Amino acid sequence: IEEASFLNGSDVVILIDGVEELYMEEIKADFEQDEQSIKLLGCQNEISRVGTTKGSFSLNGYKTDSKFAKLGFRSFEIIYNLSNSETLGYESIRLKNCRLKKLPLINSKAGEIVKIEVEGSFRGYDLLNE
Amino acid sequence: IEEASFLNGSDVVILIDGVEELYMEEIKADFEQDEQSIKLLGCQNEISRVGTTKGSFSLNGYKTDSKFAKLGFRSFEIIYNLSNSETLGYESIRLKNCRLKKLPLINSKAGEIVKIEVEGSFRGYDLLNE
Amino acid sequence: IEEASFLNGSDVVILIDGVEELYMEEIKADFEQDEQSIKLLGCQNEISRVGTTKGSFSLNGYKTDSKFAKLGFRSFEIIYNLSNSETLGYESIRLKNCRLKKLPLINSKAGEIVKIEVEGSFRGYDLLNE
Amino acid sequence: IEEASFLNGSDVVILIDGVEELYMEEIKADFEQDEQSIKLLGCQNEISRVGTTKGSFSLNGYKTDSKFAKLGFRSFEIIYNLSNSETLGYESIRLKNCRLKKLPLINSKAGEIVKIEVEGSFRGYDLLNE
Amino acid sequence: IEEASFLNGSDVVILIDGVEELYMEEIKADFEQDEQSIKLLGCQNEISRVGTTKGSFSLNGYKTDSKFAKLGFRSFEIIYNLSNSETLGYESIRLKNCRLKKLPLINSKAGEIVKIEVEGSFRGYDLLNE
Amino acid sequence: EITKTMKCHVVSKNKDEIVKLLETLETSLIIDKRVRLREDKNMYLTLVSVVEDRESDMFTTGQLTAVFKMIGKIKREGPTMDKIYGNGNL
Amino acid sequence: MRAGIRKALIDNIKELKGCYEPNVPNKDTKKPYMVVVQGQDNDHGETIGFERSIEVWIYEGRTTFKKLDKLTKQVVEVLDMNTIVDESENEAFTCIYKGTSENDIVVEEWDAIARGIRFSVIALEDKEDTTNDRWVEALSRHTKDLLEIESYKDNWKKNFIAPCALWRTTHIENKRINYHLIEITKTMKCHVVSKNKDEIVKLLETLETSLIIDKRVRLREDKNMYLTLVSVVEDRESDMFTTGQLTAVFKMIGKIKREGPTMDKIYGNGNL
Amino acid sequence: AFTCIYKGTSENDIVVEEWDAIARGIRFSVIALEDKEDTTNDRWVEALSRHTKDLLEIESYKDNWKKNFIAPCALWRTTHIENKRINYHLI
């Protein structure tokens, strides 16, 4: 019975703005696009087109510094290395011109560990490896 | 007491863009249509018409490659073979001109297995078998 | 195996309008901004800009006085000292011109402890320490 | 270790329209205001103002009479004495010109105790004691 | 220690359109009104007025006949006798010109008991007893 | 993350002394919400919950149950870009 | 096992005058002498197998009980967890200290005092130390390489060499996650035995840290298989032999081994 | 036929001086004395026992143990049954 593999999520390595960020816990990023649905005058099937693209991302992790608060709304790059070790074919993606949607200055509850949640947008992406 | 059968969902075989995709877990697809409700000037029952049709689909499964990220917003076909083995009358459906609504570049949580979720639209469908 | 640290949320010390507030339980604050997404006439990637910023905050804690009810909609400052004791590098943030969105006059249930929830906005923030 | 105290919610005493109401279970009241956010032509920080105020309240408790149903939409006063007994500094708040948003004529389920829920608005408030 | 009483919800007796309906399980009815909030040109407290009233009700119970389906959108009266037996002071309310918002023709799940849910509106109410 | 639910005993001929000792130990563990793992002070054991069960046996079981957690860091390192250099052409 | 215990007692103890079988020694036998009595063999579960109970009844000349206490400590030192080889059977074993007789009897007619030390032996019927559980083999190999101690498979063997570890599977959950994929999950528990309990703690600590920082284990030296860890948990209160301190859950995802013909070459013509 | 199962040993290794002998009692047991059929009216058990025999090429006893079981073997009893009328036409 031949083998398989699941990319365990603990293999993610995120380098934010060059420096390796090691407290991040979950990262999401999608490349949206407006469908631009058009109804033709003779055909009864709607048609979709690329329209224009838009980025959006997010990160959650344990707070250890004021890195994001001091960063402000400056543009920055994000690297995401989804390493695979059962088969060595890692995957690396770069997000270009990442900008925060909202600066998370303060978020904390008394009886809990302090976590930092971020969300924003990026102009474009590059698929460095797969 | 005569027999019956439930089409177990693990019998699904999805060939995306020709190549058999074997990590997909759940697939959904519906053929929408605008009702075009019209109120007549003499009759008190509203009337519905076909209007125009619109496709929509989705897939979830375990991530193993950058197939969808590299695919971009290119059009592609999807086959869905809901095999039945208690009775051999399988069912096959083809979705035409599938296009992603959003490219899922990155989605992962540290303590979990990495899964890929997709959603988009398709121009039309064909019922190859039943 | 080198050490690490989680900023425990019980280390928060909030000084509201100068006086140290010692019944607060959880505090949140974010610095929002309008994305101002612009679609260029030649480029298919949407572009984001700083737009204008807007503050928003919130606090929850055990009620012990009519401090907030008597304060009204007066402007005031908030300090938030997220102390760290495993490493002594505390973090202090100041929120400027905090104003309540709604005055919480009364909130209580018979079989429960009386807690006070607040939410509002602030003109600007300062990162005193990190 | 010096003492502290929480205001237990069972100490609430609500006098509605003068008469002491003794079946009420939880009461809420907030003093809202429109933020009136204004974007200046030179400054990138949004500015907030008092605008105009608006009251809102609510009560839940066990039904024992048709008091609220017979009261109609008549204006009335509400007193709320959040007594504290560990320290004798009670708190009293008066809500002025309370008016029901909706008259709860009937609300009952067969296998449950009948409770009455109310919600409305008030022109203004007075902080009689603290 | 002097007694008290909760109006148990199983004491409800609903006579719909004169005939006593004995399978109903829970009934709700409220007398809504548009607040008509007005901002004065000199006063900073918003003012509320009666506006115009609107009724709304609902019933749920075990289906035993096609009474509501055959009734159609005909107007009808509802009586609701919230009997109290610990103290004999029952309460009776009449809802005038009740009209269904939607005719519940069919509602049923295979592995469950069939229940009928109704919702509508009423022109006015009378408080026959309290 | 390394978590341990460590239980503590207190023995004495005077049971009231046991109660007093457990009380002061609990108060110390709570007000000082972490414990120095070693005298170097780099490490710590952040408390999670401390609970006493007075009915529990003095010798076998132990009165006080405490839960501590600690977060290690994987000790990986690599070379650093101290100096960078380049030329320009056309 | 009588020969092995008798030889060990005679060799490693010098106050002893002789170690006999139950009803052998005459009244003129020179005290102190010991007597080795075998007890029941009881099925004590899958992990232990059959457990023999052996007693060593020390005897003394009714001078004082302190001499007998010293002799008892000597016997416990000699036999407790030390591998002993029975030359007659030419197979080894490892006695385990368990306790002492009900009281410290006095026998006046023989003019002696006696005390029965109580030992036991593990897994009388096991002689293989092999398994067809590939996962247990993989983790036992991993433990042996990491830890440099013995690593026994699913069940103890009678001649275990303390310190040692034992990896076994307790529970198995298979799952057809997809048409082509199957998930195999095993909750595998691990023992660590040693005379020094602090050594047990240290061994468990290093094993846990290794399993965590290296989040998967090579099923075979050919690679292409892995046991991705799910959760590893130690329960120090649990018994050293019967239960096992450390509980680990591993999962693996197979793939249904189906194949078919391939479209290497495609050809066609055109007409009108 | 029957199939004895090893279970243990007598309480101790006794010595009987009056007989001039030593003795030890091995302890065996036998299973399912009153079963002789190896048949079942549970169709499901029959089906899975057939499947196990075909796949595995060993014995497959159906309802309960029989006293002369041939090791190696498998048994496929049923423990718990839950019926359910999911629909008007289906069960």
Residue numbers in the entry:
A (entry chain B), B (entry chain A), C (entry chain C), D (entry chain D), E (entry chain E): 7 to 136
F (entry chain d): 183 to 272
G (entry chain R): 1 to 272
H (entry chain P): 92 to 182
Provide passages from the article that reported this PDB entry.
Here, we reveal the extended and contracted atomic structures of an intact contractile-tailed phage (φCD508) that binds to and penetrates the protective S-layer of the Gram-positive human pathogen Clostridioides difficile. The virion can be divided into five distinct regions: the head, neck, tail, baseplate, and needle. Structures of purified φCD508 virions in both extended and contracted conformations were determined by single-particle EM of frozen-hydrated samples; the resolution ranged from 2.6 to 4.0 Å for the extended phage, and 2.9 to 4.2 Å for the contracted form.
